[PDB]
Amino acid sequence: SSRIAGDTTGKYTPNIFSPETPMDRSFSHVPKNPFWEAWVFRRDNIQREFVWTWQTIFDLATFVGGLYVAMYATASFCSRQNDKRNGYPERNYYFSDSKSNFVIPDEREFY
Amino acid sequence: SGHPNGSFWSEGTQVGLNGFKYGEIPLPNGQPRKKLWLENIWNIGYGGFFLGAFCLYYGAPPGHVIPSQWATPKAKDEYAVDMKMIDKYNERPDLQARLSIVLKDLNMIEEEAYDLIMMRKDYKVLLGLHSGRVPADLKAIYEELEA
Amino acid sequence: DEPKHQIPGNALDNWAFLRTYAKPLPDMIHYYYYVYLFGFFFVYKVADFPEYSPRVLVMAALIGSLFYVRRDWVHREFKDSP
Amino acid sequence: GWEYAGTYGALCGMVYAIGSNVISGRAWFRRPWVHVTSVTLSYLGSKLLDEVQDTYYLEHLKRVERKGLQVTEEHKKLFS
Amino acid sequence: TFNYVIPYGGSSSYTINNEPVKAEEVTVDFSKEPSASSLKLADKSDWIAYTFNNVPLMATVGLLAGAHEAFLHYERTPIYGKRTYNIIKKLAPIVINKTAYATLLGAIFCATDALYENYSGKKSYTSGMVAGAATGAVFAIGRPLPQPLVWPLVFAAAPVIADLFGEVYPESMKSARGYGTPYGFENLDDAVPTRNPIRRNPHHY
Amino acid sequence: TTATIEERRAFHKEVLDIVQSKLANKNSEWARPEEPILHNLKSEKEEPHVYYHNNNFRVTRQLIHFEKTKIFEDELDKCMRTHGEAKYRKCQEIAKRFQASCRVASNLERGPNARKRDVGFIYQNNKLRELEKDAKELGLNNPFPPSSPRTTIGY
Amino acid sequence: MSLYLFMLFLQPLSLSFVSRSFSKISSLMMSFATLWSAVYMWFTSNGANQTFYQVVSWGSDWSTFGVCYTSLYISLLCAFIFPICVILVQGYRALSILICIQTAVSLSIVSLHMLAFYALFESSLLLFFILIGRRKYGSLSAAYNISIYTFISALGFLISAFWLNWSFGSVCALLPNEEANSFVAFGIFILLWVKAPLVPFHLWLPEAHVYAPTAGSVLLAGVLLKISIVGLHVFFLPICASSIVKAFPLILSICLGSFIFSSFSTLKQIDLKKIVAYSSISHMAIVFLSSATNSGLGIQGAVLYCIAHGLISPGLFLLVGILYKNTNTKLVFYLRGLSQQAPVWWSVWVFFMLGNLAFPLFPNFIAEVVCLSALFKNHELYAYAFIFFSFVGTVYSSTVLGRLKGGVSSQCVDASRLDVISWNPLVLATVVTGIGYM
Amino acid sequence: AFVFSTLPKLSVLYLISNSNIGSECVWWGLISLWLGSISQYQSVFVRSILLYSSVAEIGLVLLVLQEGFSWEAFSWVSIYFLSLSGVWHANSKFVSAISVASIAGLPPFLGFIGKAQILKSLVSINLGILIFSSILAATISFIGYLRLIRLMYLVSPVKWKNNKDSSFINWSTWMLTVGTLPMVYSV
Ligand SMILES: CCCCCCCCCCCCCCCCCC(=O)OC[C@H](COP(=O)([O-])OCC(O)COP(=O)([O-])OC[C@@H](COC(=O)CCCCCCCCCCCCCCCCC)OC(=O)CCCCCCCCCCCCCCCCC)OC(=O)CCCCCCCCCCCCCCCCC
Ligand SMILES: CCCCCCCCCCCCCCCCCC(=O)OC[C@H](COP(=O)([O-])OCC(O)COP(=O)([O-])OC[C@@H](COC(=O)CCCCCCCCCCCCCCCCC)OC(=O)CCCCCCCCCCCCCCCCC)OC(=O)CCCCCCCCCCCCCCCCC
Ligand SMILES: CCCCCCCCCCCCCCCCCC(=O)OC[C@H](COP(=O)([O-])OCC(O)COP(=O)([O-])OC[C@@H](COC(=O)CCCCCCCCCCCCCCCCC)OC(=O)CCCCCCCCCCCCCCCCC)OC(=O)CCCCCCCCCCCCCCCCC
Ligand SMILES: CCCCCCCCCCCCCCCCCC(=O)O[C@@H](COC(=O)CCCCCCCCCCCCCCC)COP(=O)(O)OCC[N+](C)(C)C
Ligand SMILES: CCCCCCCCCCCCCCCCCC(=O)O[C@@H](COC(=O)CCCCCCCCCCCCCCC)COP(=O)(O)OCC[N+](C)(C)C
Ligand SMILES: CCCCCCCCCCCCCCCCCCCC(=O)O[C@H](COC(=O)CCCCCCCCCCCCCC)COP(=O)(O)OCCN
Ligand SMILES: CCCCCCCCCCCCCCCCCCCC(=O)O[C@H](COC(=O)CCCCCCCCCCCCCC)COP(=O)(O)OCCN
Ligand SMILES: CCCCCCCCCCCCCCCCCCCC(=O)O[C@H](COC(=O)CCCCCCCCCCCCCC)COP(=O)(O)OCCN
């Protein structure tokens, strides 16, 4: 019911007319399950079940936007500390409103 | 149980192939397996890459592949000069006071005194002295320690 | 058989909704004629319009885009009734 | 202008011949006469395009000098 | 720099400044200055006056939208069949309601903008965002759940785009010329012009 | 400090002369300069020839600094391994020099956002000294520790 | 340099004249010859020439090509990984598409002109639209995603390049120009934001990798993600440093958010290629942030970590492709007992997964140490944030390994001689770089 | 359709440039750009896609020409003629694919140069709204061009008439591929 397809000698021919099923690469293919396939389809196409609810907005804001806000605040604090550490004047960052034009330290200058 | 013949130093009980490497079946008469089309080209090309990389990493003159190799002797000479100068700085307290005045104008703390001795020949100090940012006393202080 | 997307709604109800697009179709020259005429006169009048702030212009464009009704929408929903 | 215009033109004539053969289903070596003709005309055309570009470059230089752009002798050397 | 040892870019001295030098000897401008009507309309001092000056744009847009829809309805009604109902009684509510609601939205936008700028006392992005937020809130009074969020965001975002690309963008790139020497770099030896190029005359249409 | 356009163009011409002088004789170490081109330009990018030359000089200097720091570390390790339990006393000087070399190498080209490298806790120690002086003279109570004689093996 | 460019132009040229039955052999020989030409370019590149090792121009500013530290590493990496792509791909159509893509990408790396960089890099726009949208195994949605994302980001970059060419008069990197404008800085930045997958512009990469062929995935992960750092070191940092320092808190916000959310999204994956593709996105953020510090450590560490990624992720993608050939499945839940069924494949899979988790004997360790050191030079908290959330990667990698390792399976799915030949160079390069020959 | 969507425009552009017919209003070119892009994206039939592309591009070219950039519009009209020649006289899929790529503005072909001229002229006049709109509308139009590529090679088997009368079609495709590097000086 089966036969060896591969030939190391190089005399390989595919027996498409052979009564016996070749032991080709498809021999070892996984059989698969109907419900697992539908679970895969459901999980990939989870945007179909997306619904805007106040709970969904709450979750998205509190975790994603919350983490962005926390990271931005921490980065701003670190920049302020580094400016105090280095001796630089308060730097004009994009959303900080500063009446100083200091952006890039002059290498030649001693701070 | 135990060992097969009762002796640990007896011939192995398994004759044949433990497994089929790459899944290939040994030929009946001992005929060698025909080599794959890519084997020669693959070995030549990738072995050439690795051999050339080895040769260039080790054969090449210093500073050609690894720039830091070039700097090693120059750093030795600079280390000797810096050693002499820092030793002279520790001995002479009059120079310490002058470098204290130089440091303050450069917004540097006193402990950075060794640092200034180590940045004698650098973009910052060399150009600041020309421009006027660095006090001209630093030139004389450097010279008094044999430059 | 393969996993497939669920189609909301019944087959005949959806087909009935789609069949409401099969209505007498006017020819587009009637709309185009009026748009051409009023557009020519409109371009003549625009050169006399007062200069508006960019912010107001953008808000007016947004309002116009929101208020614009696609020609198909009127097609499906038109009723010859009071 | 460009110092590699003729070589480019010859290669692009080869591009014409081979592409015309491939689009029609023929092999690249088919219709050999088309190759020579394409190469020669493409080389001549690339050259001619280069002189045309240079000539209008020089005309623009003359115009801007008349208008008041103070072009130096080296800048006049930029435009052949 | 293009090396792994020292930082890329460069730095400019803050103490050292470079004297401005004119891009050309004689400057001829083909860009006309703002008209007095533009300054009048842009004036937000009196919020009522500012609102009444800028609403005709919104009313115009609402009238075109209503006319479009009303013509789409009129085109469909059959001339060959006599109609029991009056067509203008059907069509007038369309145009009138579209124009009125557009004018109301534009009025909220302009009034809130002027009121915020007066109270804050400064010209800022925030005035446009707040006026847009209020206008989008009025847009979504009784609308389903995503729309209370999305319309305030869109209507607020619109003035941000208008400010960013209508005011900040032109002012950021006034100095750049494209002819002669680069604005930052005049030390470089480039052909220096007696006069700036005039690619077109001041417009008059 | 103000730069007129005339002076800027004169420096441009002089830099062209420098480039011509360098071009006359071939040099295999052209991109490893031993001296910078001195200038008073607001931005070094204004004169491209000075920019690249001084950038190469800075790179050479930093490579030398790195190798020097490795040297200093080697003698510090040897001195530590030689003395034994007397290391803290006898290796104070060599550690001092090694940490100074580390600070030089790091701080000269730290970058726009990078902070100063505090090898040996010298800047913190100085800050504590200033704080203690001010607190004592002004009668305040300092919530921070007083300055330490030694905080690391050297500095 | 000239030899490398000539060979890069020769590879697509050869396909037109080959017999169409010798195409695979000729393509493999051409790929190895290009690798040798790249080694020659490295040989003729003297470290004494500190700014640029080599610069060549062929009659115009657009034809200006040059190699620097970043360019040389990335070009050697692409020339190293291309032959593996060549052997994995069968058919004249596929060979033609992949050769044209590689020629365009490799010409982009050495280009010194922003407009020529744009022209060469986006020439491979339809080729991926056709490649990812191939008949049976491709998805049109993914091709649309990648094509549209690339088009919008590259058009913004093009607008910034036009403004620079108008103002300065030149857009070549070798001419020193500086700008403080934020619009032009954002125009250049948006390309980097999209090409290096950075949240929320990372959605194109997953769909592309899953529905691209194994050779296509190998090239995409290996060098096309690295094109962002060539653009950053060559065309953004020299001119747009003021804007990166002005926006550094925002840059850190976006980078660290990308790291965290990509790590969390990886946990929700059931497809092996998607797991590797999301690991790539989390890995890109450290590179982008380390370069953005504009320090000597950051640039070197980023290029090193790019090399480490371009040696580790192609191996994982290749192993997954081999397993999919053997099993016709990519779902982790179908695949069990792989340790017993495929000991040789499992060993290399575990080795490369350890490499992706940045264990010491792997190049990812050295690269990560350097990048974290640069972040620590900026601030302590910056490094601490990245170091902690690295544990999320361990969770999903360990869960995947545990799911694959054991169970009951009735299929011997182990790699053949061709497959082992395919990954041997990557394993050797990984070891050699791991012991410190970075 | 091909000859009367390209040839008439050159005379109008010359008349506008030479006789100073320019207006300060940018609404019409902006409306042309946005309407053309959105209608191209929403149009099912292939002829409408190609027709709306011209509306968008001619609106953008009108915005450029009002500001006095005559040279760039005179190059754009010729590059557009060559680019549209192949898609309109569709005989081979590959020629039509190159033509559609050229119309999109895609880098390896001469169409990139022609669009680049117009876009480069835009950044000079420094009108931000126009540039932002240009980017977004260009993306929207690119989706329709991608629809055109999809229809030929990625939807169904395609069989066309064997109308072997490619008088200048092969030359036009050759010119689109080749001409990029000689004309690179323009942009
Ligand atoms: C009595 C005669 C009746 C007419 C009365 C008026 C007569 C004309 C008088 C004067 C005419 C000149 C001025 C009129 C406008 C020019 C248009 C024109 O004439 O073209 C010929 C046109 C017919 O041409 P066609 O080729 O047969 O139709 C092509 C379509 O495919 C048609 O097919 P379709 O309808 O089936 O498909 C429509 C499609 C067609 O697409 C368009 O309409 C393109 C319009 C885009 C904007 C146009 C450029 C705007 C620039 C304005 C410049 C001024 C301000 C400057 C600063 C602004 C900066 C942007 O759009 C849509 O799908 C619906 C959406 C509409 C806007 C889309 C943009 C949405 C953005 C909002 C985002 C918010 C959503 C967030 C939440 C989303 C959740 C995910 O005739 C008209 O439509 C005129 C109707 C007049 C009503 C306009 C109402 C407002 C006008 C001013 C506001 C400007 C915004 C434009 C709104 C839409 C206008 C189309
Ligand atoms: C790049 C940057 C861009 C910047 C700007 C770019 C510039 C833009 C513009 C540039 C445009 C370039 C792209 C377009 C290229 C033009 C298209 C094209 O390639 O041709 C299309 C066109 C398409 O031909 P087709 O596909 O067969 O379709 C036409 C049908 O047959 C329809 O049939 P039909 O009824 O219409 O027949 C009429 C026609 C069409 O008939 C034919 O085409 C049939 C073939 C003609 C006879 C075969 C030609 C014999 C010589 C060919 C040499 C091939 C050598 C390869 C093998 C080596 C053999 C040893 O007959 C003709 O050939 C008229 C020409 C008369 C010459 C005939 C030969 C005279 C005897 C040889 C003279 C000298 C011999 C010296 C040495 C000879 C041995 C090497 O090709 C021709 O018509 C060929 C005309 C010339 C024949 C070749 C003569 C060359 C002279 C011999 C070589 C000596 C060295 C050359 C230098 C010195 C010159 C004297
Ligand atoms: C002097 C001594 C001689 C020494 C030699 C020196 C000569 C110098 C070079 C001369 C060599 C001849 C050139 C080849 C001519 C024919 C090429 C061809 O037909 O393509 C496919 C052809 C093989 O296709 P095929 O199997 O025979 O069937 C084709 C059927 O006709 C239709 O089959 P289908 O219906 O099934 O279509 C399926 C299609 C799937 O559908 C698509 O994907 C269509 C997509 C639209 C085009 C692709 C957009 C992206 C292309 C990027 C360009 C690639 C280079 C990237 C480098 C960056 C450059 C900035 O897939 C393909 O066709 C292949 C995909 C990859 C090829 C795309 C590259 C072709 C670019 C345009 C070709 C030139 C035509 C000129 C026309 C001449 C007059 C008619 O050639 C190849 O084997 C690979 C392409 C080789 C590319 C070299 C062409 C140069 C283009 C680079 C532009 C640089 C400017 C030009 C300067 C050139 C140097 C001066
Ligand atoms: C399918 C695989 C089957 C085959 C298995 C192969 C088995 C491999 C054997 C493991 C090798 C372990 C050797 C580790 C040492 C690394 C070798 C090395 O790097 O060579 C050094 C020379 O050093 C040595 O030879 C080390 C001696 C190895 C033997 C020492 C005792 C062996 C105990 C192993 C402990 C090693 C721990 C090291 C941890 C990093 C090169 O010297 P340099 O010229 O200075 O090169 C520059 C440095 N750098 C590489 C970073 C660029
Ligand atoms: C610097 C150059 C770059 C700038 C570009 C613009 C300048 C253009 C310069 C080169 C122009 C070359 C134009 C090439 C046109 C291609 C030739 C052609 O079309 O021939 C046709 C001509 O078709 C005709 O209709 C013939 C009638 C006219 C014949 C030619 C008339 C010549 C008039 C004299 C022109 C001389 C110039 C006058 C003085 C300047 C034959 O093809 P068909 O038989 O119709 O079908 C082809 C079928 N198939 C290919 C698939 C096999
Ligand atoms: C619609 C979308 C958004 C809706 C939902 C948003 C809800 C989130 C709001 C809370 C977010 C966390 C708190 C951070 C913001 C606090 C308020 C900002 C003001 C601020 O900067 O104060 C600083 C907060 O401390 C700080 O520097 C930050 C401390 C908190 C960060 C650490 C806590 C989480 C750690 C997890 C890792 C994340 C960070 C990784 C680096 C301390 O004031 P100051 O002395 O700096 O002076 C600065 C002058 N205002
Ligand atoms: C294409 C940009 C469109 C923005 C997209 C954001 C997401 C859309 C969501 C809609 C939300 C409405 C839009 C708000 C965006 C503004 C950012 C808020 C920051 C902020 O509030 O500060 C203002 C300035 O920022 C500003 O208002 C100017 C900042 C410019 C916005 C950011 C530009 C880059 C964003 C691109 C992200 C990627 C593009 C993909 C969309 C206040 O400033 P103030 O002067 O009033 O001081 C106050 C004195 N009263
Ligand atoms: C809301 C968070 C921000 C999201 C961005 C996250 C991090 C991106 C940073 C990229 C780094 C370089 C980019 C330069 C700046 C981009 C955005 C920085 C934040 C920002 O919007 O600052 C604004 C200034 O920038 C501007 O005025 C222009 C903003 C960018 C324009 C958006 C689209 C431009 C497309 C142009 C295409 C190419 C055109 C070339 C001619 C307003 O801040 P402010 O200083 O006014 O302070 C007022 C506060 N009270």
For every residue of H50-91, DSSP letters joined together read HHHHHHHHHHHHHHHHHTT-HHHHHHHHHHHHHHHHHHHT--
Taking CB atoms and an 8 Å cutoff, what residues of chain G touch H142?
A: 147-148, 151
CB of residue A57 inside a 6 A radius of ligand 6: no
- Cα(A11)–Cα(C49) distance, integer angstroms: 86
CB atoms inside a 10 Å sphere around CB G360: 10
Q: How many CA atoms, within 13 angstroms, populate the side-chain half-sphere of residue G369?
A: 9
The values of phi and psi at residue G390, to 5°, are -65, -15
Could you tell me which of H86, H85, H74 has the C-alpha nearest to residue H117? H74
Chain-centroid distance of CA C27 in Å reads 16
Q: How was this structure determined?
A: cryo-EM
**F139, exposed or middle or buried, with CB in 10 Å at 0-12, 13-18, 19+?**
exposed
Q: How far is the CA of H167 from the centre of ligand 5 (A)?
A: 7
Query: Which stretches of chain H sit within 8 Å of chain G by CB?
Result: 97, 101, 106-108, 112, 116, 119-120, 122-124, 128, 131, 134-135, 138-139, 142-143, 146, 149-150, 153-154, 180-181, 184-185, 187
**Cβ of G119 and H142 within 8 Å?**
no
Radius of gyration of chain C (CA): 21
Look up residue B119 and give its two tokens.
């940045």
Taking CB atoms and an 8 Å cutoff, what residues of chain C touch E128?
A: 55
- Cα(H172)–Cα(H95) distance, integer angstroms: 9
- Cα(F66)–Cα(F60) distance, integer angstroms: 10
**Cβ of G122 and H107 within 8 Å?**
yes
- Is A77 strand, coil or helix? helix
DSSP string, G201-263: S-SHHHHHHHHS-HHHHHHIIIIITTHHHHHIIIIIHHHHHHHHHHTHHHHHHHHHHHHHHHH
**F141, exposed or middle or buried, with CB in 10 Å at 0-12, 13-18, 19+?**
exposed
SS3 content of chain A, % helix, strand, coil (to 5): 45, 5, 55
Could you tell me which of H99, H96, H20, H35 has the C-alpha nearest to residue H65? H20
* Alpha-carbon gap: E168 to the closest alpha carbon of chain C (Å): 12
- Cα(G214)–Cα(G81) distance, integer angstroms: 12
Nearest ligand atom owner, CA of H49: 1
CA angle E83, E86, E92 (to 5 degrees): 135
- Cα(G342)–Cα(G348) distance, integer angstroms: 10
If you count DSSP H runs as helices and E runs as strands, how many of each does chain F have, helices first? 5, 1
From residue G175, alpha-carbon distances to C14, F111, G178, G192 in Å are 64, 22, 10, 22
N residues, chain C: 82
Contacts of C2 (CB under 8 A, 6+ apart): A37
* Alpha-carbon gap: G236 to the closest alpha carbon of chain A (Å): 16
Could you tell me which of G299, G283, G154, G200 has the C-alpha nearest to residue G241? G299
From residue F79, alpha-carbon distances to B91, B103, G305 in Å are 22, 30, 36
Which atom in ligand 3 lies closest to the alpha carbon of residue D25? 31
Please, what is the angle between helix D5-23 and helix D32-67, to 10°?
Answer: 140
Contacts of G84 (CB under 8 A, 6+ apart): G215, G218, G314, G318, G422, G425, G426
- What's the one-letter identity of residue G432? V
Chains C and B touch (3+ CB pairs under 8 A): no
- What's the one-letter identity of residue D76? K
- Is E189 strand, coil or helix? coil
- Cα(E127)–Cα(E134) distance, integer angstroms: 11
The b-or-e profile of F2-39 (16+ CB within 10 A means b, else e) is ebeeeebeebbeebeeeeeeeeeeeeeeebbbeebbeb
- Cα(G50)–Cα(G70) distance, integer angstroms: 13
**Signed CA dihedral, G215, G287, G231, F52: sign only:** negative
- Cα(B54)–Cα(G437) distance, integer angstroms: 10
Look up residue E201 and give its two tokens.
């005359």
Which atom in ligand 7 lies closest to the alpha carbon of residue E124? 46
Whether the Cβ atoms of residue E196 and residue E24 lie closer than 8 Å to each other: yes
Q: How far is the CA of E163 from the centre of ligand 8 (A)?
A: 12
Look up residue G306 and give its two tokens.
């790019």
N residues, chain H: 187
Look up residue H11 and give its two tokens.
């005379």
Which atom in ligand 3 lies closest to the alpha carbon of residue G9? 57
- What's the one-letter identity of residue G416? S
**A8, exposed or middle or buried, with CB in 10 Å at 0-12, 13-18, 19+?**
middle
**Cβ of D75 and E191 within 8 Å?**
yes
Torsion, CA G331, CA G337, CA G342, CA G347, rounded to 10: 90
**G3, exposed or middle or buried, with CB in 10 Å at 0-12, 13-18, 19+?**
middle
The DSSP code for F150 is -
Chain-centroid distance of CA E202 in Å reads 22
Which atom in ligand 5 lies closest to the alpha carbon of residue H164? 51
Whether the Cβ atoms of residue G419 and residue G322 lie closer than 8 Å to each other: yes
Q: Which chains touch A (3 or more CB pairs under 8 A)?
A: B, C, E, F, G
- What's the one-letter identity of residue H70? S
- Cα(E112)–Cα(E105) distance, integer angstroms: 11
Look up residue C55 and give its two tokens.
């912010």
Nearest CA in chain H to D46: H182
Look up residue F15 and give its two tokens.
């830099």
Q: Which helix (H) or strand (E) holds B82?
A: helix B67-91
The b-or-e profile of G176-188 (16+ CB within 10 A means b, else e) is bbbbbbbbbbebb
Chain-centroid distance of CA G58 in Å reads 28
* Alpha-carbon gap: E87 to the closest alpha carbon of chain H (Å): 31
Nearest ligand atom owner, CA of D51: 5
- Cα(G264)–Cα(G278) distance, integer angstroms: 9
The values of phi and psi at residue G155, to 5°, are -70, -40
Residues with CB under 6 A from ligand 8: A 94-95, 97; E 164, 168; G 156, 159-160, 163, 182-187, 189, 243-244, 247, 250-251, 254; H 123, 131
SS3 of A46-61: CCCCCCCCHHHHHHHH
The DSSP code for G19 is -
CB of residue A60 inside a 6 A radius of ligand 6: no
Nearest CA in chain A to B123: A108
Contacts of B105 (CB under 8 A, 6+ apart): B134, B135
- Cα(G49)–Cα(D14) distance, integer angstroms: 39
The values of phi and psi at residue G298, to 5°, are -65, -45
Residue G59 has its nearest CB partner, among D4, D18, D28, at: D4
Chain-centroid distance of CA H80 in Å reads 5
- G64 - beta bridge partners? G57
Could you tell me which of G263, E164, A27 has the C-alpha nearest to residue H132? E164
- Cα(E169)–Cα(B114) distance, integer angstroms: 50
Chain-centroid distance of CA B102 in Å reads 35
- Cα(G251)–Cα(A72) distance, integer angstroms: 9
- Cα(E201)–Cα(H21) distance, integer angstroms: 10
Radius of gyration of chain D (CA): 19
Look up residue H74 and give its two tokens.
């005179």
Could you tell me how many CB contacts below 8 A there are between chain A and chain F? 11
Chains A and G touch (3+ CB pairs under 8 A): yes
Could you tell me which of G189, G178, G167, G184 has the C-alpha nearest to residue G248? G189
Whether the Cβ atoms of residue B124 and residue F108 lie closer than 8 Å to each other: yes
* Alpha-carbon gap: E190 to the closest alpha carbon of chain F (Å): 11
**Cβ of F111 and G294 within 8 Å?**
yes
Torsion, CA G359, CA G360, CA G361, CA G367, rounded to 10: 90
- What's the one-letter identity of residue A61? A
Could you tell me which of G80, G41, G84 has the C-alpha nearest to residue G215? G84
Nearest CA in chain H to D48: H182
Whether the Cβ atoms of residue G145 and residue G204 lie closer than 8 Å to each other: yes
- What's the one-letter identity of residue A79? S
Chain-centroid distance of CA E156 in Å reads 13
Could you tell me how many CB contacts below 8 A there are between chain C and chain H? 6
**H78, exposed or middle or buried, with CB in 10 Å at 0-12, 13-18, 19+?**
middle
F123 and chain B: CB distance < 8 Å anywhere?
yes
The protein residue whose alpha carbon is closest to atom 41 in ligand 5 is H167
DSSP string, F76-127: HHHHHHHHSTTHHHHTHHHHHHHHHHHHHHHHHT--SSPPP--TTSHHHHHH
The DSSP code for G200 is T
Q: How far is the CA of H69 from the centre of ligand 6 (A)?
A: 51
The residue among G45, G49, G50 with the most chain F CBs within 10 A of its CB, best to mutate, is G50
Q: How far is the CA of C70 from the centre of ligand 1 (A)?
A: 9
Contacts of G196 (CB under 8 A, 6+ apart): G225, G228, G229, G284, G287, G288
Could you tell me how many CB contacts below 8 A there are between chain B and chain F? 74
Look up residue H122 and give its two tokens.
């835009």
* Alpha-carbon gap: E23 to the closest alpha carbon of chain G (Å): 13
Please, what is the angle between helix G69-88 and helix G296-327, to 10°?
Answer: 0
- Cα(E87)–Cα(H119) distance, integer angstroms: 49
**Cβ of G58 and D4 within 8 Å?**
yes
From residue C27, alpha-carbon distances to C21, E75, E76, E187, G82 in Å are 15, 9, 10, 67, 58
Whether the Cβ atoms of residue G230 and residue A52 lie closer than 8 Å to each other: no
- On the question of a cis peptide bond just before residue G200, with omega within 30 degrees of 0, the verdict is yes
Could you tell me the end-to-end alpha-carbon distance of chain A, in angstroms, rounded to an integer? 85
- G111 - beta bridge partners? G65
- Cα(F74)–Cα(F81) distance, integer angstroms: 11
DSSP string, G179-195: ---HHHHHHHHHHHHHH
